[PDB]
Amino acid sequence: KRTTMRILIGLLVQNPELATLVPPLENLDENKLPGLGLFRELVNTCLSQPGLTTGQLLEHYRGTNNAATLEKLSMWDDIADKNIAEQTFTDSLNHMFDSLLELRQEELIARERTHGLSNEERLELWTLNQELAK
């Protein structure tokens, strides 16, 4: 639950164009979920300057007064980039052999259109069709 806010903050700092996908936060009350005030603040800053880059966003956090905040904004950016690199990795792992599966599939289809397929081969084609979900 604490990482939810941190992930949101982090992702938005990494890509401020995501402010675009935040529904309205005005009627919420800040006082109820730690970090929400910060999120709201960034979202507002993002809406007030569309097209922002990460660096341009981080300009609003110069000065001594903002240092503890600038800090967490950068930490959280990194924690988030890792979380999604992790997720890309796990997702790529799952599709590792796709190039190889998707040509046994071509081979089975071609076999099927000229000679046809045995019972086992029909089942394998079916399995490949599930696995290549598009």
PDB file of C-alpha atoms in Angstrom:
ATOM      1  CA  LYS A   1       0.000   0.000   0.000  1.00  0.00           C
ATOM      2  CA  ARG A   2       2.945   2.390   0.609  1.00  0.00           C
ATOM      3  CA  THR A   3       4.621   1.157  -2.587  1.00  0.00           C
ATOM      4  CA  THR A   4       1.457   1.917  -4.578  1.00  0.00           C
ATOM      5  CA  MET A   5       1.935   5.673  -3.993  1.00  0.00           C
ATOM      6  CA  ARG A   6       5.687   5.347  -4.517  1.00  0.00           C
ATOM      7  CA  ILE A   7       5.245   3.463  -7.754  1.00  0.00           C
ATOM      8  CA  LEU A   8       2.795   6.058  -9.039  1.00  0.00           C
ATOM      9  CA  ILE A   9       5.056   8.917  -8.032  1.00  0.00           C
ATOM     10  CA  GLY A  10       8.089   7.173  -9.470  1.00  0.00           C
ATOM     11  CA  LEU A  11       6.489   6.301 -12.805  1.00  0.00           C
ATOM     12  CA  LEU A  12       5.149   9.789 -13.262  1.00  0.00           C
ATOM     13  CA  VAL A  13       8.544  11.339 -12.555  1.00  0.00           C
ATOM     14  CA  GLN A  14      10.073   8.964 -15.119  1.00  0.00           C
ATOM     15  CA  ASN A  15       7.388   9.817 -17.685  1.00  0.00           C
ATOM     16  CA  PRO A  16       5.424  12.999 -16.875  1.00  0.00           C
ATOM     17  CA  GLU A  17       3.185  12.420 -19.891  1.00  0.00           C
ATOM     18  CA  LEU A  18       1.285   9.953 -17.766  1.00  0.00           C
ATOM     19  CA  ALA A  19      -0.373  12.826 -15.885  1.00  0.00           C
ATOM     20  CA  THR A  20      -2.715  12.624 -18.879  1.00  0.00           C
ATOM     21  CA  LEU A  21      -4.171   9.367 -17.599  1.00  0.00           C
ATOM     22  CA  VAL A  22      -4.827  10.405 -14.043  1.00  0.00           C
ATOM     23  CA  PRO A  23      -8.551  10.896 -13.322  1.00  0.00           C
ATOM     24  CA  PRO A  24      -9.552  13.988 -11.240  1.00  0.00           C
ATOM     25  CA  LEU A  25      -7.903  14.338  -7.808  1.00  0.00           C
ATOM     26  CA  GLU A  26      -9.520  17.607  -6.614  1.00  0.00           C
ATOM     27  CA  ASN A  27     -12.378  16.099  -4.620  1.00  0.00           C
ATOM     28  CA  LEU A  28     -10.147  13.625  -2.786  1.00  0.00           C
ATOM     29  CA  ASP A  29      -8.748  14.488   0.579  1.00  0.00           C
ATOM     30  CA  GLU A  30      -4.962  14.545   0.697  1.00  0.00           C
ATOM     31  CA  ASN A  31      -5.111  14.013   4.430  1.00  0.00           C
ATOM     32  CA  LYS A  32      -6.124  10.352   4.225  1.00  0.00           C
ATOM     33  CA  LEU A  33      -3.370   8.614   2.196  1.00  0.00           C
ATOM     34  CA  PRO A  34       0.337   9.362   2.761  1.00  0.00           C
ATOM     35  CA  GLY A  35       2.050  10.614  -0.429  1.00  0.00           C
ATOM     36  CA  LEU A  36      -1.199  11.631  -2.160  1.00  0.00           C
ATOM     37  CA  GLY A  37      -0.442  15.331  -1.630  1.00  0.00           C
ATOM     38  CA  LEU A  38       2.861  14.931  -3.363  1.00  0.00           C
ATOM     39  CA  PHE A  39       1.202  13.008  -6.225  1.00  0.00           C
ATOM     40  CA  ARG A  40      -1.446  15.647  -6.610  1.00  0.00           C
ATOM     41  CA  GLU A  41       1.187  18.379  -6.605  1.00  0.00           C
ATOM     42  CA  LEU A  42       3.165  16.661  -9.412  1.00  0.00           C
ATOM     43  CA  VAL A  43       0.052  15.944 -11.463  1.00  0.00           C
ATOM     44  CA  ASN A  44      -0.945  19.610 -11.169  1.00  0.00           C
ATOM     45  CA  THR A  45       2.547  20.733 -12.148  1.00  0.00           C
ATOM     46  CA  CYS A  46       2.314  18.310 -15.067  1.00  0.00           C
ATOM     47  CA  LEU A  47      -1.066  19.696 -16.206  1.00  0.00           C
ATOM     48  CA  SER A  48       0.242  23.271 -15.920  1.00  0.00           C
ATOM     49  CA  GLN A  49       3.111  22.515 -18.337  1.00  0.00           C
ATOM     50  CA  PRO A  50       2.097  19.785 -20.864  1.00  0.00           C
ATOM     51  CA  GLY A  51       4.955  18.012 -22.704  1.00  0.00           C
ATOM     52  CA  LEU A  52       7.325  18.105 -19.690  1.00  0.00           C
ATOM     53  CA  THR A  53      10.487  16.012 -19.579  1.00  0.00           C
ATOM     54  CA  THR A  54      11.751  14.432 -16.345  1.00  0.00           C
ATOM     55  CA  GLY A  55      14.475  17.091 -16.024  1.00  0.00           C
ATOM     56  CA  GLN A  56      12.071  19.965 -16.591  1.00  0.00           C
ATOM     57  CA  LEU A  57       9.756  18.462 -13.940  1.00  0.00           C
ATOM     58  CA  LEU A  58      12.682  18.215 -11.537  1.00  0.00           C
ATOM     59  CA  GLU A  59      13.385  21.950 -11.949  1.00  0.00           C
ATOM     60  CA  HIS A  60      10.374  22.653  -9.682  1.00  0.00           C
ATOM     61  CA  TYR A  61      12.431  20.975  -6.952  1.00  0.00           C
ATOM     62  CA  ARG A  62      15.639  23.052  -6.932  1.00  0.00           C
ATOM     63  CA  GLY A  63      16.681  24.892  -3.777  1.00  0.00           C
ATOM     64  CA  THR A  64      17.498  23.826  -0.233  1.00  0.00           C
ATOM     65  CA  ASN A  65      13.835  23.629   0.815  1.00  0.00           C
ATOM     66  CA  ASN A  66      13.088  20.959  -1.787  1.00  0.00           C
ATOM     67  CA  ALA A  67      16.193  18.765  -1.251  1.00  0.00           C
ATOM     68  CA  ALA A  68      14.562  15.993   0.865  1.00  0.00           C
ATOM     69  CA  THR A  69      11.801  15.908  -1.783  1.00  0.00           C
ATOM     70  CA  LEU A  70      14.034  15.999  -4.866  1.00  0.00           C
ATOM     71  CA  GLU A  71      15.812  13.099  -3.235  1.00  0.00           C
ATOM     72  CA  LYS A  72      12.817  10.826  -2.771  1.00  0.00           C
ATOM     73  CA  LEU A  73      11.613  11.780  -6.275  1.00  0.00           C
ATOM     74  CA  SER A  74      14.854  10.449  -7.721  1.00  0.00           C
ATOM     75  CA  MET A  75      15.016   7.363  -5.514  1.00  0.00           C
ATOM     76  CA  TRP A  76      11.441   6.504  -6.466  1.00  0.00           C
ATOM     77  CA  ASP A  77      12.080   7.043 -10.174  1.00  0.00           C
ATOM     78  CA  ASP A  78      14.823   4.371  -9.940  1.00  0.00           C
ATOM     79  CA  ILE A  79      12.806   1.945  -7.836  1.00  0.00           C
ATOM     80  CA  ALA A  80      10.101   2.174 -10.528  1.00  0.00           C
ATOM     81  CA  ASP A  81      12.401   1.743 -13.515  1.00  0.00           C
ATOM     82  CA  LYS A  82      13.656  -1.407 -11.835  1.00  0.00           C
ATOM     83  CA  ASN A  83      10.148  -2.680 -11.114  1.00  0.00           C
ATOM     84  CA  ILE A  84       9.257  -2.433 -14.736  1.00  0.00           C
ATOM     85  CA  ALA A  85      12.570  -3.757 -16.053  1.00  0.00           C
ATOM     86  CA  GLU A  86      11.880  -6.725 -13.804  1.00  0.00           C
ATOM     87  CA  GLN A  87       8.467  -7.122 -15.385  1.00  0.00           C
ATOM     88  CA  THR A  88       9.844  -6.834 -18.931  1.00  0.00           C
ATOM     89  CA  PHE A  89      12.381  -9.530 -18.094  1.00  0.00           C
ATOM     90  CA  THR A  90       9.767 -11.936 -16.710  1.00  0.00           C
ATOM     91  CA  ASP A  91       7.618 -11.254 -19.747  1.00  0.00           C
ATOM     92  CA  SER A  92      10.392 -11.840 -22.204  1.00  0.00           C
ATOM     93  CA  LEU A  93      11.288 -15.077 -20.387  1.00  0.00           C
ATOM     94  CA  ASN A  94       7.781 -16.324 -21.025  1.00  0.00           C
ATOM     95  CA  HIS A  95       8.069 -15.626 -24.805  1.00  0.00           C
ATOM     96  CA  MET A  96      11.693 -16.988 -25.105  1.00  0.00           C
ATOM     97  CA  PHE A  97      10.969 -19.793 -27.533  1.00  0.00           C
ATOM     98  CA  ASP A  98       8.261 -18.030 -29.535  1.00  0.00           C
ATOM     99  CA  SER A  99      10.365 -17.712 -32.692  1.00  0.00           C
ATOM    100  CA  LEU A 100      10.877 -21.503 -32.579  1.00  0.00           C
ATOM    101  CA  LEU A 101       7.339 -22.423 -31.655  1.00  0.00           C
ATOM    102  CA  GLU A 102       5.905 -20.152 -34.282  1.00  0.00           C
ATOM    103  CA  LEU A 103       7.704 -21.940 -37.037  1.00  0.00           C
ATOM    104  CA  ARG A 104       6.749 -25.447 -35.978  1.00  0.00           C
ATOM    105  CA  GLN A 105       3.293 -23.894 -36.289  1.00  0.00           C
ATOM    106  CA  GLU A 106       3.943 -22.686 -39.863  1.00  0.00           C
ATOM    107  CA  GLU A 107       5.333 -26.137 -40.587  1.00  0.00           C
ATOM    108  CA  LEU A 108       2.227 -27.853 -39.198  1.00  0.00           C
ATOM    109  CA  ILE A 109      -0.170 -25.561 -41.053  1.00  0.00           C
ATOM    110  CA  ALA A 110       1.703 -26.141 -44.353  1.00  0.00           C
ATOM    111  CA  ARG A 111       1.705 -29.886 -43.661  1.00  0.00           C
ATOM    112  CA  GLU A 112      -1.983 -29.657 -43.024  1.00  0.00           C
ATOM    113  CA  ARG A 113      -2.868 -27.980 -46.311  1.00  0.00           C
ATOM    114  CA  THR A 114      -1.067 -30.731 -48.279  1.00  0.00           C
ATOM    115  CA  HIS A 115      -1.171 -34.235 -46.760  1.00  0.00           C
ATOM    116  CA  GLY A 116      -2.967 -33.281 -43.609  1.00  0.00           C
ATOM    117  CA  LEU A 117      -2.044 -34.000 -40.057  1.00  0.00           C
ATOM    118  CA  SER A 118      -2.233 -36.929 -37.735  1.00  0.00           C
ATOM    119  CA  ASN A 119      -4.159 -36.845 -34.478  1.00  0.00           C
ATOM    120  CA  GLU A 120      -1.135 -35.996 -32.323  1.00  0.00           C
ATOM    121  CA  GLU A 121      -0.109 -33.299 -34.759  1.00  0.00           C
ATOM    122  CA  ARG A 122      -3.583 -31.738 -34.666  1.00  0.00           C
ATOM    123  CA  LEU A 123      -3.326 -31.523 -30.861  1.00  0.00           C
ATOM    124  CA  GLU A 124       0.130 -29.973 -31.038  1.00  0.00           C
ATOM    125  CA  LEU A 125      -1.120 -27.377 -33.549  1.00  0.00           C
ATOM    126  CA  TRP A 126      -3.882 -26.641 -31.061  1.00  0.00           C
ATOM    127  CA  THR A 127      -1.398 -26.205 -28.218  1.00  0.00           C
ATOM    128  CA  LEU A 128       0.755 -23.898 -30.315  1.00  0.00           C
ATOM    129  CA  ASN A 129      -2.321 -21.841 -31.247  1.00  0.00           C
ATOM    130  CA  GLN A 130      -3.088 -21.225 -27.532  1.00  0.00           C
ATOM    131  CA  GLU A 131       0.545 -20.403 -26.712  1.00  0.00           C
ATOM    132  CA  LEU A 132       0.919 -17.849 -29.530  1.00  0.00           C
ATOM    133  CA  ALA A 133      -2.175 -15.845 -28.341  1.00  0.00           C
ATOM    134  CA  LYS A 134      -2.890 -13.185 -31.032  1.00  0.00           C
TER     135      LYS A 134
END
